[PDB]
Every structure is written in C-alpha cells, then in structure tokens.
Design a protein around this ligand. Structure first.
Ligand SMILES: *CC(=O)NCCNC(=O)CCNC(=O)[C@H](O)C(C)(C)COP(*)(=O)O
Ligand SMILES: [Mg+2]
Lengths: 95, 306
C-alpha cells in the first residue's frame, strides 16, 4: 500500500516524505511525555536525546506500524535511534 | 481535561537513586517540611542516610520515596490550585495515599513505611531466593496466555504480579525461567523492560502479611481518609481508616490491577490525574494517558524555573 504512494517520487522525495511522517509521529509521541515540546523537532537528533522513554518508543512503533502497515520490530526506536534512520529503515522494508 | 473531577494518584516505587532526587529534596520547602518531621520520627538524618545508602530500594530509599511523593502531592495542589475529589495509590503508592488522605498521621506513615521496608529486607534474606518479577509491554492478553500455558505445562510456579494495561504485565517466577521467558516474549514481538530482584512488587507473600500485621500495622491507628481512596487490588472505593489498613495488608497477597483503578476513577467522574512522585510508568502508560489528562509532579518539574 505504501510502495504505491512512494513510486513516482525521486529517492530524495521519498526520503523527504518518510522523514516528514516519522517526524509527525515523533512529535505526537513526544507530546505525551511533556506537551512543553514544540510542534517541529530536529530529525537528526536521537529520540532519547529529544526526551523519549521506553513507553514513547513503543508508542511511536504503534503509530508507524499503524500508517506504514509494515512489520517493524517493537524496539525500532532503539535499533534506529534518530527519526532519519527510522525513515531509512522503513524504505528498506517497503522495497 | 477540565470537564470533570481531578484525582491525586501516587505511583509505585521505581528504582530511585539519591542522584535523581537529591537537589530537589534539599531545595523544595515541602520536602524540607516533611524531612524534619521524618528525621524527628526516626532519630537519624534521612537525606544523609539515603545519600550514602546502597542499592535502588533501600530502607531509607523507601522512606525518601514517601517524603518526595507526599511533598510533591502538596506542592502540586498549592502551585497549580488543584482540589482532588478522590485519591489512589499503586503498591507503595498505598503508603503515600495513607499519609496524604490523612488515614495516618505522616509520622505513623513514616513508622509504617520503615517497618514494612525492614520486614521485607529480613523476609527476602530466607524466603523467595532467586525469584524475579519481569516487566514487559506489547504482550497482548492472547500472547501472554500462550506463555503462561507453557509454564502450566512445564509446571513452573508463576504469578501475574501487576496488570498494567491490555498488553503490559509484570510476571513473577524463578530466575531459572528468565532467559527462557525473554526468548518467548520477543518471539510474540513483545519487549522485555526490567527484572526486579528480590521481587518486592509481587503479591505471593502470605507469610509476610501475617508478620507485617503483628509487628507494624497493628500498633498504628487509622482515621477515616478526608476523601475516597481507590484500591489497586480491585478498584473498590474505600472511605474508612479500616478499609485503608486492609488495602495495605491485601497488597502482600493481591496483585495490582491498574486498569480496574482507572475504570473505577472514570466511574467516579475523573478527567484529570496528578501523578505525584518520581514516576515513568503510572503517568506515562496508556491505561492512564488514554483516559485522563496527566500532570506528572516529578522532582524534575518542581526544579523547572518559569
Ligand atoms: C506497584 C508496582 O507494581 N510497582 C512496581 C512497578 N514497576 C516495576 O516492577 C519496575 C518496572 N519498570 C519498568 O518496567 C521500566 O523500567 C519503566 C518504568 C516502564 C521505564 O522503562 P524505560 O522508560 O526505561
Ligand atoms: Mg494491592
């Protein structure tokens, strides 16, 4: 289903799109911890640095499993510690 | 959010190191206010004997946790003009709600929290050696029951010690299962979180409950709480010093059912909860965050300048 919406875009536009989505859910997951965090966030900074705990990591994994409809490991936020790397990993799965 | 009553929740004791709460305990005035009442009750310097203590769940770590949660419970009320209509505590939280609800004088609560801490210390030296509580999340009820079935079939003594959420349980059993269990949890695609040892938050200590009643809970004197208290075991709403007394003893033989507490607080028309103390679970987990607008009165939040 994902591969559909991706095909047609440059590799870099697919980067942009995925990084954008993984960002959307990273701020969403980060709002549950301390709503004090802004609406946007530096996608190159590791999650735990931004203020993830174990339960946010598992929260992100639901949201991403949700939208992507893919087999992501529960520990995806730990194994790929920056939004960019989660988007990197998501692409590799979809193809 | 604001469309109903506010509840004051007290969290279960996490692995608290003086390192994490130190500056707050000596800075915050509510803590200093209680620490002085506590030092008087105990006849030693709690902060100094906490600071230089070993471990995560020390005798003095336990007292300190009560001081901090209760202090933060008050701090939150005054600073954020909260007026709770009902309070609740999970496991150790019971000791905190006891003091807060007025059900016990704060000095009695200290005497109690100390007495139990010491009864357990002495208990786990001989009883339940090598037993371990395993926290884990993304283990749906269907997938746990597969693993519990294998333990039944293997004939391995085991106890769900806390129900946290639909897919989040603490499981207490012998450590000879630890590697085995983590193996199966990852198979179903759940994530192991923590191995408690000795298994303090487990609820299979009939032996302890009797000795705790004789030496600690009996000499104490329990007044009716100034507001309803919800019970971790079943979610029942208590209103009598006696019911509180029971709530505390029951926790040696009756596991935490956090869903029931939420379900019950919801029935009591709650929309807002203030989780008072160093928490990272009872304030954060879905069971709470799906149902209520959370206010984590962490020591971090208390030290935040404005
Ligand atoms: C009342 C009661 O049962 N209290 C004890 C509940 N807690 C434990 O058994 C400790 C479990 N701790 C964890 O599972 C994790 O360390 C946390 C607290 C969920 C945080 O995980 P991550 O953010 O490091
Ligand atoms: Mg209990």
């Amino acid at each position: 289903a994902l591969a559909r919406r991706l095909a047609g875009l440059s590799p870099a536009e697919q980067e942009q799109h995925l990084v954008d989505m993984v960002h959307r859910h990273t701020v969403a997951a980060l709002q549950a911890v301390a709503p004090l965090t802004p609406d946007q966030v530096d996608v190159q900074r590791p999650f735990l640095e931004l203020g993830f705990d174990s339960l946010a990591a598992v929260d992100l994994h639901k949201r991403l499993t949700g939208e992507t409809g893919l087999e992501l490991p529960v520990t995806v936020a730990f194994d790929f510690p920056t939004p960019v790397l989660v988007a990197e990993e998501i692409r590799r799965i979809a193809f | 959010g604001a469309a109903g009553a506010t509840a004051m929740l007290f969290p279960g004791m996490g692995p608290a190191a003086f390192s994490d709460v130190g500056r707050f305990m000596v800075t915050n005035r509510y803590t200093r206010e209680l620490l002085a009442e506590a030092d008087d009750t105990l006849g030693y310097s709690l902060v100094d004997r906490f600071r230089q203590a070993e471990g995560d769940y020390s005798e003095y770590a336990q007292i300190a946790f009560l001081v901090n949660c209760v202090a933060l419970a008050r701090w939150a009320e005054q600073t954020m003009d909260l007026t709770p209509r009902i309070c609740a505590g999970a496991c150790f939280g019971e000791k905190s709600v006891a003091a807060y609800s007025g059900a016990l004088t704060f000095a009695d609560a200290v005497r109690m929290t100390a007495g139990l801490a010491r009864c357990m210390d002495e208990y786990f030296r001989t009883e339940h050696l090598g037993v371990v509580t395993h926290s884990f999340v993304r283990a749906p009820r269907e997938r746990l029951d597969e693993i519990l079935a294998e333990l039944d079939e293997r004939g391995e003594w085991h106890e769900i010690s806390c129900h946290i959420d639909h897919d989040f349980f603490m499981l207490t059993l012998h450590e000879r299962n630890s590697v085995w269990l983590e193996g199966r949890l990852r198979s179903v695609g759940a994530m192991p979180l923590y191995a408690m040892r000795p298994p303090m938050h487990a609820a299979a200590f009939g032996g302890l409950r009797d000795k705790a009643e004789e030496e600690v809970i009996a000499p104490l004197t329990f007044h009716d709480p100034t507001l309803p208290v919800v019970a971790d075991q079943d979610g029942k709403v208590l209103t009598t010093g006696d019911e509180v007394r029971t709530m505390l003893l029951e926790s040696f033989v009756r596991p935490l059912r956090w869903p029931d507490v939420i379900s019950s607080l919801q029935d009591q028309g709650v929309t807002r909860v203030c989780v008072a103390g160093p928490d990272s679970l009872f304030g954060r987990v879905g069971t709470t965050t799906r149902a209520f607008e959370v206010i984590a009165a962490t020591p971090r939040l208390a030290l935040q300048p404005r």
